[PDB]
């Protein structure tokens, strides 16, 4: 019952990007596909929409002549394209579907935004992408311990991490990447773990950085 968007691309200024919206489950009764973006720590900005009902389009003026929003009637999916990209366009993009209209006027229909996709981060920069290096935050001490993984020097966000291939969840904290002096990001993920656990239980952190198609799994053991 939920929306699935493409992966996180990174484009150089002046090029174009396309973001999709496959529907897990079947298609479903809806009347509108819109897109709204949210810059890094900002609020929400509407981009535009289609209402296949009336065959009509609306955009914001930021995007006039730059955007194209498509709704495939059959698949129930929307690709979305944004051209002449600026550094100012770097944000997370959200696919949004609306089910029944609430006001139609001037050839368009507006309503509640019933269903949102996961989000898609597109970063616009001439900088070359670099994938991360991963180093262990090993533990030591008799009660609860803390171990971790350090993800250093990667340029395009984002970077996802998990522990024991999703097996481990409780007491995991993964921090907001901080952009370093170099121009690359760095990030740290940690987890609190009983002291008796170590030696016995194995801890591996799995970090994907799709803008460079690199995943590294890193084993974290106490040091000798």
């Amino acid at each position: 019952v939920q929306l699935e968007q493409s992966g996180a691309e990174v484009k150089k200024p002046g090029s174009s990007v396309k973001v999709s919206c496959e529907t897990s489950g079947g298609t479903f009764d809806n009347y509108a596909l819109n897109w709204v973006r949210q810059a890094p720590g900002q609020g929400l900005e509407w981009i535009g929409g289609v209402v296949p009902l009336f065959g009509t389009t609306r955009n914001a003026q930021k995007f006039q002549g730059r955007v194209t929003i498509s709704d495939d009637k059959s698949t129930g999916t929307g690709h979305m394209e944004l051209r002449s990209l600026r550094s100012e366009d770097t944000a997370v993009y959200y696919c949004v579907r609306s089910v029944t209209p609430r006001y139609c006027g001037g050839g368009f229909c507006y309503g509640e935004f019933d269903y949102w996709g996961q989000g898609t981060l597109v970063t616009v920069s001439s900088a070359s992408t670099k994938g991360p290096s991963v180093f262990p935050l090993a533990p030591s001490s008799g009660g609860t311990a803390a171990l971790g993984c350090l993800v250093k020097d990667y340029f395009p966000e984002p970077v996802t991490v998990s522990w024991n291939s999703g097996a481990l969840t409780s007491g995991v904290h993964t921090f907001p990447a901080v952009l370093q002096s170099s121009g690359l990001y760095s990030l740290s993920s940690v987890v609190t773990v009983p002291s008796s656990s170590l030696g016995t239980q194995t801890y591996i952190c799995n970090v994907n950085h799709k803008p460079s198609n690199t995943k590294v799994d890193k084993r974290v053991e106490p040091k000798s």
Partner: protein, 212 residues
């Protein structure tokens, strides 16, 4: 250009009390408002369409109110899951606008950080840089002071830090100060420590490690 102004921006409220947000349109949106809730990491979730008609599968603690140039979303008996930013959107006329949002912290009893220090890896050092990491795990209030002392001298300008969004179960925060040095500057100095002042610690806390 319907500028929606959400006030206020920050909120801290104690669990089980009542939080009250206001969205105030600049040019009368008249009942065509929506209230979305964005939790950390996650996409926004619709709460209230129309002026005050709660969406499917939302609990009735959330209540909307308003018309024209002035609105109100109020949540009663707050769970810690309700820590979120809250946005309002109009759809009266295009272009569609959102408010800047209203982050809401959920108050809880004070909690002191656990502190942990992590020396750089032997693998990282073969690169040419060294990264020392201090972790303050699961703590509250958000405000905290973390100071780096190397060779016992206070450090300045060579650490970054970053903090989580408030946890949705316990209502705590966690923080990571990272101190970065070249390999050489790291091998000349012996004793590394981070000193942590927090409202829940009667006196500062240091965790340290001596190289080797």
């Amino acid at each position: 250009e319907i500028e929606l102004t959400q006030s206020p921006a920050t909120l801290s409220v104690s669990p089980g009390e009542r939080a009250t947000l206001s969205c105030r349109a600049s040019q009368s949106v008249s009942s065509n408002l929506a209230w979305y809730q964005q939790k950390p990491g996650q996409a926004p979730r619709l709460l209230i369409y129309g002026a005050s008609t709660r969406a499917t599968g939302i609990p009735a603690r959330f209540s909307g109110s308003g018309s024209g140039t002035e609105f109100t979303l109020t949540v009663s008996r707050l769970e810690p899951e309700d820590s979120a930013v809250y946005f309002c959107q109009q759809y009266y006329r295009s272009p569609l606008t959102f408010g800047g949002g209203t982050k809401v912290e959920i108050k809880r009893t004070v909690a002191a950080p656990s502190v942990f220090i992590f020396p750089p890896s032997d693998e990282q050092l073969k690169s040419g840089t060294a990264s020392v990491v201090c972790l303050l795990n699961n703590f509250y209030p958000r405000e905290a002071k973390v100071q780096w002392k190397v060779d016992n001298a206070l450090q300045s300008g060579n650490s970054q830090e970053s903090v989580t969004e408030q946890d949705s179960k316990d209502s705590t925060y966690s923080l990571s100060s990272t101190l970065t040095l070249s390999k050489a500057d790291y091998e000349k100095h012996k004793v590394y420590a981070c000193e942590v002042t927090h409202q829940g610690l009667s006196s500062p806390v240091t965790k340290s490690f001596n190289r080797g």
